[PDB]
Enzyme design. Structure first.
Site, PDB file in Angstrom:
ATOM      1  N   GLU A  89       2.851   5.476  -3.741  1.00 38.66           N
ATOM      2  CA  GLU A  89       2.983   6.658  -4.463  1.00 38.66           C
ATOM      3  C   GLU A  89       4.388   7.406  -4.112  1.00 38.66           C
ATOM      4  O   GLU A  89       4.907   7.600  -5.305  1.00 38.66           O
ATOM      5  CB  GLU A  89       1.919   7.592  -4.381  1.00 38.66           C
ATOM      6  CG  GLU A  89       0.509   6.943  -4.802  1.00 38.66           C
ATOM      7  CD  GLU A  89      -0.196   6.209  -3.920  1.00 38.66           C
ATOM      8  OE1 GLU A  89       0.220   5.865  -2.625  1.00 38.66           O
ATOM      9  OE2 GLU A  89      -1.407   5.496  -4.190  1.00 38.66           O
TER      10      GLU A  89
ATOM     11  N   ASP B 143      -8.293   3.579  -3.541  1.00 41.80           N
ATOM     12  CA  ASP B 143      -9.361   3.841  -2.736  1.00 41.80           C
ATOM     13  C   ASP B 143     -10.673   4.517  -3.567  1.00 41.80           C
ATOM     14  O   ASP B 143     -10.928   5.783  -2.990  1.00 41.80           O
ATOM     15  CB  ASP B 143      -8.733   4.430  -1.548  1.00 41.80           C
ATOM     16  CG  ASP B 143      -7.777   3.682  -0.681  1.00 41.80           C
ATOM     17  OD1 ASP B 143      -7.810   2.647  -0.760  1.00 41.80           O
ATOM     18  OD2 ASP B 143      -7.284   4.436   0.279  1.00 41.80           O
TER      19      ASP B 143
ATOM     20  N   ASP C  88       0.702  -1.316  -0.152  1.00 46.40           N
ATOM     21  CA  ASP C  88       0.084  -0.032  -0.010  1.00 46.40           C
ATOM     22  C   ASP C  88       0.825   1.250  -0.080  1.00 46.40           C
ATOM     23  O   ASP C  88       2.218   1.303   0.288  1.00 46.40           O
ATOM     24  CB  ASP C  88      -0.736   0.023   1.282  1.00 46.40           C
ATOM     25  CG  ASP C  88      -2.309   0.678   1.077  1.00 46.40           C
ATOM     26  OD1 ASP C  88      -2.407   1.570   0.068  1.00 46.40           O
ATOM     27  OD2 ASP C  88      -3.182   0.583   1.991  1.00 46.40           O
TER      28      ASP C  88
END
Ligand SMILES: *[C@@H]1O[C@@](F)(CO)[C@@H](O)[C@H](O)[C@H]1O
Ligand code: NI
Length: 949
Positions: free
Chosen positions: A551, A625, A548
């Site tokens: 980025e 998300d 997760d």
């Protein structure tokens, strides 16, 4: 005399500095003879393959030639000729001719017969502007190409604005939860362009959007110039009305401009007035939003209602022709839906269509311009060029092609094992079960230890998952709490980004904890990151990794300047230069890490971000998300198609959406208390049903999200249409497994792409160019999701082809027409192309539960076709050493003949003898899909057989 007369270049072996160009081994370097301010000084054409050209350009008098993060070494040297004919220098391989003018440095590409493929902006399209960051130097670069009116563009990654066909469009290339940037585009003119830059980039307009007050005169609700009106109706208390300078509440700094004493949770905010432009043309707007939002412009509903949870805003774009000097009404209606939420509207002034149509790339910071041109016979061949340049995609483990069940989050060992056992007990097939975040002791994120109160025996848990013939994936982040020994080991070596530490940031967990993210661009930091996973998780037998916030997402909702501060400096340079490749670096760490421990075992990584080259590390992306919204479902179709066209063939999404509207949570709570369905809970069921139908035909079939629970029996009980539908599609995924796993084999052996826009197989039918809500799943199935609540039909365009067949009934449908097609609650419209050869197997509970001894080979007649059935050991890399088998099949329509070819290869556990039942579907024979369909029985032992149907 002229600058040219005073200074120009022109003996076979003299120094290269005397000559207009120099040929080396694999490249030609051309000195630009008419140098312009901000233009190139040197342009190089380097031959990488018969169809592959690397173009470099610089304003300097030498190339910096840094090592690429994305392009790998090539397999062989490529032969080529060079001819200089006046101003033109042409490098020719067997398949492409790449030319450059010495005068300007402008480049163009043709095929072997001189037919133009791609031409740079006439007179040159490259601009260089120096940039310096933290003592490092480089250039901001623009590269523009001509583009004809009938050219269409796909790729750029996975964006959430529901854009499809980038011709004449704009996109910003940065990474942010739900937005994955890949600097690669494919054209319907059968080439691709890969821009080798790791900075913030832009496709199309090179400029940032402007706040409304910079480009329009604004008039408020009372007609007073200089502002719009903001009306804030709180859930309780007095309404506030004020003038607004600009609608720009888009990050942590600018939301401080919202009214100080006005709680936003449950508020209704209206921004309104009139706008007046100073020029005429198409203005391009961008809306940034969280909570619920609608926009009206000139009395038109330009943005029907969208939603995101308050903490994960999105962007959506729209355009309108406006006339200079004319006032037009504007209204934004916004329900913030949280105490902190976002709303902004900005625009670009009109760009002449002649310029807006060009292919324009902009890159904030590199050491030189580097791009790669790859020509192809078709779009698959372009993708093959991308795979040659950035690495082949390994065959995913066969289990990854089955159904994945996930949750945010299983809280205990018992809960996770209970969900798995629920599938087995209900005979709903499943391969993979996923353990999300928060499995560690609360104060110990990054320790990679389990909270033993909730997971008393992690090894026994994994052993139990394996005993039920499932695979376990676990959440791992690049985030570490400052108190952990693991954090300290990065930190003492200088491998932790410090801004989050310096600024004393606390996360959301419990009282809030201090944390940092590690520098994945450092090679030794990558090895340490893997070593920690290896010491703590690998010995448990965990099969797959789920990264997760890659980025990296160090802090939500910050501006560009602060995001750059949060994720650098890096081992390679500034975060301005090295901005977009963090997920790639992490994928290298895990793939190379795990193959370093066990070179035979397949690797699976799912990551939230992505970049060019990701596929070489057996790594997929998921779309992050996203909301539990019909419009987000629709956006996933176009996002997934663009991602596939970006060269990365394994991709997925949270079926049902990730972040949940409050009304759906309340619907579930009501169901739990009373077993009564309210209007919102009815919608919840229908949303999930449609989204599972869609998800069954994407590369990885996976349900995940926040509460409610997402196992099908939690959504609806046995016998309910939602349950019946979702179980139908889950089972169908497994009946399709012989076909699906053949596609997976093709990803490696044929540089294939699984989820395919219609433009790939139907490039010659230009009606498909803008269709981003239908797709092909492999070569044979056309899928058309339903993405509106209450709809029981939808319009479908059938590409030009010999024909199509409804999968469920076998009824024939002509190609080359658009029509309204029935779509009952329980069914996704699904058609099969004439010429399809499709292998179906028997019901199984998990991949390879039983050998595929009896396959139904469906032959959809009316056109020629080919298909190769691929099998191997599923779980290891033995296919790399030739341990696999292929059964090629060919169907000739003119003679109605099917050849089941001689089997090529073998592997341990392969069926030597097996059975096919060959089932035909044709215009005069509407054969519903049926495992028990009548057909011709073939007992196959590896030897070729031919059938005349
Ligand atoms: C990252 O965050 C979680 F761990 C918690 O929200 C996951 O459940 C999400 O899917 C992911 O984006
Ligand atoms: Ni440790």
């Amino acid at each position: 005399g002229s600058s040219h007369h005073h200074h120009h270049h022109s003996l076979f072996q003299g120094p290269a500095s005397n000559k207009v160009y120099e040929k080396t081994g694999d490249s030609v370097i051309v000195k630009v003879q008419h140098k312009e301010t901000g233009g190139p000084r040197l342009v190089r054409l380097q031959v990488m393959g018969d169809k592959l050209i690397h173009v470099s350009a610089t304003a300097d008098s030498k190339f910096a030639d840094p090592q690429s993060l994305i392009v790998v070494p090539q397999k062989k040297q490529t032969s080529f000729a060079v001819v200089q004919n006046g101003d033109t220098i042409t490098v020719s391989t067997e398949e492409v001719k790449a030319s450059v003018l010495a005068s300007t440095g402008e480049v163009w590409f043709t095929d072997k017969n001189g037919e133009l493929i791609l031409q740079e902006n006439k007179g040159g399209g490259k601009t260089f502007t120096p940039i310096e960051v933290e003592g490092t130097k480089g250039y901001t670069v623009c590269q523009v190409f001509e583009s004809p009116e009938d050219e269409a563009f796909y790729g750029l990654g996975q964006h959430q604005a529901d854009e499809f066909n980038y011709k004449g469009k704009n996109e910003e290339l940065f990474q942010y939860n739900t937005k994955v940037s890949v600097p690669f585009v494919v054209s319907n003119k059968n080439y691709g362009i890969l821009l080798d830059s790791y900075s913030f980039c832009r496709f199309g307009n090179p400029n940032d959007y402007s706040q409304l007050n910079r480009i329009f005169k604004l008039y408020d609700k009372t007609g007073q110039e200089g502002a719009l009106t903001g009306t804030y109706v709180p859930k309780k208390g007095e309404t506030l009305v004020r003038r607004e300078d600009s609608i720009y509440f888009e990050n942590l700094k600018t939301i401080e401009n919202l009214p100080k004493k006005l709680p936003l949770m449950g508020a209704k905010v209206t921004y309104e007035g009139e706008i007046e432009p100073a020029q005429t043309g198409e203005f391009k707007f961008i809306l940034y939003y969280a909570g619920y939002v609608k926009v009206y412009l000139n009395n038109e509903p330009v943005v029907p209602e969208r939603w995101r949870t308050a903490w994960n805003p999105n962007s959506y774009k729209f355009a309108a022709h406006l006339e200079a000097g004319k006032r037009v009404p504007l209204k934004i209606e916004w329900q913030p839906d949280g105490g902190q939420s976002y709303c902004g509207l900005r625009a670009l002034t009109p760009v002449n269509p002649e310029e807006q149509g060009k292919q324009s790339w902009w890159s904030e910071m590199t050491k030189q311009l580097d791009y790669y041109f790859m020509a192809g016979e078709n779009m698959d061949d372009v993708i093959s060029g991308y795979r040659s340049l950035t690495g082949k995609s390994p065959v995913m483990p066969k289990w990854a092609m089955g159904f994945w069940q996930s949750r945010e989050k299983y809280n205990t060992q018992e809960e996770m094992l209970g969900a798995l056992k629920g599938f087995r007990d209900r005979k709903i097939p499943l391969d993979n079960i996923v353990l999300d975040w928060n499995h560690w002791p609360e104060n110990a994120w990054g320790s990679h230890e389990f909270d033993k109160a909730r997971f008393p025996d992690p090894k026994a848990m994994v052993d139990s998952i394996h005993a039920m013939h499932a695979r376990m994936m676990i959440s791992v982040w690049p985030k570490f709490y400052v108190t952990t020994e693991h954090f300290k080991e990065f930190d003492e070596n200088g491998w932790m980004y410090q801004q989050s530490v310096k600024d004393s940031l606390k996360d959301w967990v419990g009282p809030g904890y201090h944390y940092g993210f590690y520098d994945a661009y450092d090679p030794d930091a990558r090895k340490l990151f893997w070593k920690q996973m290896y010491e703590h998780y690998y010995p448990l037998g965990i099969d797959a990794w789920w990264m997760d916030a890659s980025e990296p997402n160090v802090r939500d909702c910050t501006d560009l300047e602060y995001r750059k501060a949060l994720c650098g400096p890096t081992a390679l340079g500034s975060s301005t230069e090295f901005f977009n490749a963090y997920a790639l670096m992490n994928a290298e760490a895990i793939y190379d890490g795990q193959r370093g421990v066990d070179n035979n075992k397949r690797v699976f990584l799912l990551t939230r971000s992505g970049f060019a080259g990701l596929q070489r590390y057996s790594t997929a992306t998921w779309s992050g998300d996203i909301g539990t919204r019909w419009e987000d479902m629709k956006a996933q179709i176009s996002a997934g198609l663009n991602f596939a066209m970006s060269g990365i063939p394994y991709w997925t999404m949270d079926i049902g959406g990730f972040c949940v509207e409050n009304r759906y949570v309340a619907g579930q709570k009501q169901w739990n208390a009373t077993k009564t369905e309210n209007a919102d809970y009815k919608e919840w069921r229908e949303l999930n049903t449609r989204w599972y139908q869609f998800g069954a035909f994407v590369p990885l079939y996976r349900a995940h999200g926040q509460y409610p629970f997402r196992e099908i029996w939690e959504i609806a009980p046995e016998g309910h249409p939602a349950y019946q539908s979702v179980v139908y599609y889950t089972k169908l995924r497994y009946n399709m497994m012989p076909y699906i796993y053949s596609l997976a084999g093709m990803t490696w052996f044929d540089d294939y792409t699984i989820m395919r826009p219609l433009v790939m197989d139907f490039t010659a039918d230009a009606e498909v160019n803008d269709i981003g809500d239908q797709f092909m799943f492999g070569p044979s199935f056309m899928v058309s999701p339903v993405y509106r609540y209450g709809d029981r039909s939808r319009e479908i365009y059938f590409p030009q082809a010999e024909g199509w067949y409804d999968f469920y009934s076998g009824k024939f449908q002509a190609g080359g027409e658009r029509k309204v097609i029935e779509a009952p609650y329980e069914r996704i419209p699904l058609y099969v192309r004439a010429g399809a050869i499709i292998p179906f197997g028997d019901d199984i509970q998990y991949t390879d539960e039983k050998p595929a001894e009896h396959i139904r080979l469906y032959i959809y007649q009316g056109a020629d076709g080919e298909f190769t059935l691929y099998e191997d050991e599923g779980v290891n890399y033995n296919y790399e050493q030739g341990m696999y088998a292929m059964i090629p099949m060919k169907y000739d329509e003119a003679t109605k003949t099917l050849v089941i070819g001689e089997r090529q290869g073998e592997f341990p556990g392969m069926l030597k003898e097996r059975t096919f039942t060959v089932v035909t579907v044709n215009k005069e024979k509407a054969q519903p899909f049926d495992l028990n369909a009548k057909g011709v029985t073939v007992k196959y032992n590896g030897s070729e057989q031919t059938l005349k149907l």
